[PDB]
Structure 1
Amino acid sequence: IGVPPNSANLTEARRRVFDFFRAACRSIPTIMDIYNLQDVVAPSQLRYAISAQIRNNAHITDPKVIDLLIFKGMEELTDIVDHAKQRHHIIGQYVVGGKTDFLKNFYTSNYF
């Protein structure tokens, strides 16, 4: 229930990472019915989205940073489930459902 103490070491922190991954990913069928995503995106694509967010932070070595990231992850998850703000092609922070990149930016504006 309560906010746990900071994880002592990386084994403790990574153990907490897997519980968050399990809890966040287990709630995909609830999210699918809440946002009516049956004809929009497959459950696996949102599972791979969560895994990708976790992998993008695999380089963090401070257990206290990991604890804060998990806590913010639980809060992001809770707001998505409990108080849904349904857009069309996003949930929360994540989008759902011959020239280099300089000319495209150049044609758009002067601020890159």
Structure 2
Amino acid sequence: IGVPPNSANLTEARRRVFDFFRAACRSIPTIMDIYNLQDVVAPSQLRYAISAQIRNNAHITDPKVIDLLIFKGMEELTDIVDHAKQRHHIIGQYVTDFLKNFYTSNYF
């Protein structure tokens, strides 16, 4: 339905994180069989990829930032659910050094 108002405390933020992750999982088979990909990728590893993406922003403290990040998460998920994203965009998107940089360019 409509956009949730806000989260006053971090407990509601964690609850919304869990709800978003659960919804993304319940939507994992439809995106498996709508893009016509069954054997190329198993549904298991997408769960780990989503978990890693969620855990990436672990240092966020502001509840509003958490809410807006979760909203962007639902937006991306809904875009993927519809046959709107380009073919195999998801699989490509969701998968000393000093000398190495020096031999290529000055800007590293």
RMSD of aligned Cα (Å):
2.0
The structure-2 alpha-carbon separation of the partners of 1:37 and 1:104, relative to structure 1 and needing over 3 Å to count, comes to farther
TM-superposed deviation, 1:41: 1.0
Which has the larger share of helix?
A: 2
TM-score (norm 2): 0.85
TM-superposed deviation, 1:86: 3.4
Q: Is the aligned partner of 1:51 residue 2:47?
A: no
Structure-1 separation of matches of 2:92 and 2:71: 16
Per-residue displacement from partner, 1:27-80 (whole Å, max 9, x unpaired)?
A: 111111122221211111111111111111122111000000000000000001
TM-score (norm 1): 0.82
Structure 1 consecutive aligned stretches of length 4 or more whose deviation exceeds 2 Å: 83-94, 100-112
Amino-acid identity (%) = 100
Gaps of 5+ in 1: 95-99
Bigger RCO of structures 1 and 2 (CA < 8 A, at least 6 apart): 2
Aligned residues: 107
SS at match of 1:91: helix
